[PDB]
Swiss-Prot record, chains A, B:
Covered residues, full protein: 33 to 267 of 477
Keyword flag Cytoplasm: yes
Protein name (Swiss-Prot/TrEMBL): Stromelysin-1
Species name: Homo sapiens
Family according to the record: Belongs to the peptidase M10A family.
UniProt-annotated binding residues for Zn(2+) 2: 51, 177, 181, 187
An example Gene Ontology molecular-function term: endopeptidase activity
Keywords recorded for this protein, A-Z: Calcium, Collagen degradation, Cytoplasm, Disulfide bond, Extracellular matrix, Hydrolase, Immunity, Innate immunity, Metal-binding, Metalloprotease, Nucleus, Protease, Repeat, Secreted, Signal, Zinc, Zymogen
Length: 226, 226
């Protein structure tokens, strides 16, 4: 468990000393106590649902480019999850994009056919890319950094119970985080940041907002709104 | 058969008039008679072993970049095919790279560990990317255009009987063609060009050489040797 967790999220030698060092890097990043041992608190954090994108970097197979070379992006919802009515998914995705439009000069237009910049889809287990999903729990979704083709796309594990509220896995929250990667953001070590790797089942969705860290990160790439 | 053949190699509408037009585009490109009907000669060409990369373009999922932004590239042989002894595969790949080094200012250094520019591997059926192999015959291999991560990589269908001579599928010939895509080349309509999509089971491997078309194509991207 801990081995592959460090392999997948902290690029630990794919082929003890090195492990304790990685355990510590993980503890520093996830806001735990920097000991180096598999504490009760540490083994617990590793069972919590999170984003599939690594913490110390980007997906090696599709690095992409640092940021979009244009401010007017297009998106398209390829398929839907049966857990929710089509209009609820559409709203969730639109509100997620709106969060980023607000703090940048970026715009998003929806396409219903063709090749859009950001393609959103639901999949389970093996879905064509090198990172298969893992059933309910653990990895919730993953997204790729800016670029052509598959880059910029966001995949959501359809083995999760996606909800409009917080009775399951909130689609809005996860989509907002994943769109962040689609625009060029990495994971943050700040526990109150949307870009934090672990899913925060927060009580009040109305009290939701990007933290200053999220804003600073996205504005350092595209600038502030005009 | 003909439907998916045009879908996969001539990006025919994924969702008759349009088909006859594509049948004709295919006939023009593959050196057949531009009729528009499923002739005996046409149905035959479609059963012949070929490269998995499309004829009217590039792989849409991983477009990559037009050419490498550096002349000194690295390559690595990830795994081997049991059909041949390790040294025979190594030679086949080295001779394939040599063909391109000769007519350009490009150099190739072999890495035995780490992330190289061009990763070569053998796979069967579903292998992690969006284009699964199809058992013996038909698609022999596929490669991606220049770029980071998976781009530049060459995959060989291990369901083929790879040989050192021409008693099966010559690894050297196919590797030389695939490396071509790895460097930025597209398929050519010239029947004597290495970049022609269909495998040419040629009699004398000593009489092998890049045609002027191959040379002109590769030199238009990287220039001639100094
Ligand atoms: Ca994309
Ligand atoms: Ca999961
Ligand atoms: Ca590569
Ligand atoms: Ca095959
Ligand atoms: Zn993430
Ligand atoms: Zn995926
Ligand atoms: Zn080819
Ligand atoms: Zn492949």
């Amino acid at each position: 468990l801990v081995q592959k967790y460090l392999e997948n999220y902290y690029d630990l030698k794919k082929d003890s000393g090195p492990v304790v060092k990685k355990i510590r890097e993980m503890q520093k990043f996830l806001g735990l106590e920097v000991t180096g041992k598999l504490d009760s608190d540490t083994l617990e954090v590793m069972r919590k649902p999170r984003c599939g994108v690594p913490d110390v970097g980007h997906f090696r197979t599709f690095p992409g480019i640092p940021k979009w070379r244009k401010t007017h992006l297009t998106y398209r919802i390829v398929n839907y999850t049966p857990d929710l009515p089509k209009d609820a998914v559409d709203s969730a995705v639109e509100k997620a994009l709106k969060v980023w439009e607000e703090v940048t000069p970026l715009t998003f237009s929806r396409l219903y056919e063709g090749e859009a910049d950001i393609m959103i889809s639901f999949a389970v287990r093996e879905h064509g890319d090198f990172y298969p999903f893992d059933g309910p729990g653990n990895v919730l979704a993953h997204a790729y950094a800016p670029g052509p083709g598959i880059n910029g796309d966001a995949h959501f594990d359809d083995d999760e119970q996606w909800t409009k509220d917080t009775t399951g896995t909130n689609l809005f929250l996860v989509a907002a985080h994943e769109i962040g990667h689609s625009l060029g953001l990495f994971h943050s070590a700040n526990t109150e940041a949307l870009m934090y790797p672990l899913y925060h089942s927060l009580t009040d969705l109305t009290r939701f907002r990007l933290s200053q860290d999220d804003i600073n990160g996205i504005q350092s790439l595209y600038g502030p709104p005009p």
